[PDB]
């Protein structure tokens with residue numbers, strides 16, 4: 001199905017980035033509500049990201065899972081490239097995080113469960129996300145989690161969510177998402193990433209040395225899971241099944 005801009009009525013902007021803006025939109029005939037990502041070919045070309053975008057589309061349009069944001073298709077005109085995406089009605093976990101400041105163990109463990117399932121699927125098709133962060137986590141009509149960017153994803157910057165093996169330029173596989181999963185679990189419970197610093201160069205040393213601390217209110221069950229996920233040695237990180245059956249997950253998820 002080849003598309004065109006004239007098929008859509010454009011609504012409010014949902015996000016304004018440098019690559020481009022994403023708007024609420026409605027296809028005219030079906031009256032289908034969706035999200036339309038508008039990128040500038042010029043702004044694209046001048047950065048040479050024209051490659052992985054094609055890889056982003058190629059990968060995302062093939063993935064079908066309830067916890068992964070769906071890509072319906074795309075098209076381009078004379079001057080722009082448009083990405084037609086599933087619309088997540090409840091916004092980002094990011095905004096949810098800065099409203100509620102922190103999450104309870106129930107909401108946290110539920111997000112981790114949904115995330116692990118989405119990743120397990122992604123890993124089954126040997127796709128790693130690499131850029132798993134709260135602003136890439138969207139929420140569905142039931143408040144379910146939906147992973148939602150793949151513009152820096154491939155087959156097997158901002159340091160906060162990256163693993164030591166990735167920042168130290170080394171070799172990396174599916175185990176990098178397990179690290180990110182731990183960073184998120186911490187952030188969900190605490191309100192900020194475990195390795196947050198005021199400089200890039202300092203966040204680098206925190207990650208490279210695995211230097212994080214727990215505030216008093218983090219329970220042992222959560223401290224244990226996080227400590228298992230945040231291992232410098234990728235091989236020592238738990239499999240997704242082991243995360244899904246962790247006592248603290250089992251006790252608090254839904």
Ligand SMILES: CC(=O)NC[C@@H]1CCN(c2c(Cl)cnc3[nH]c(-c4cn(C)nc4C)nc23)C1
Pocket residue numbers: 014015016022035085086087088089090091092094095135136138148
């Ligand atoms: C920082 C930031 O905005 N990140 C999100 C990107 C922008 C829109 N994106 C969306 C995409 Cl790609 C799809 N659906 C969305 N729904 C929303 C939204 C935001 N609010 C406050 N309420 C709703 C509903 N956003 C999107 C991705």
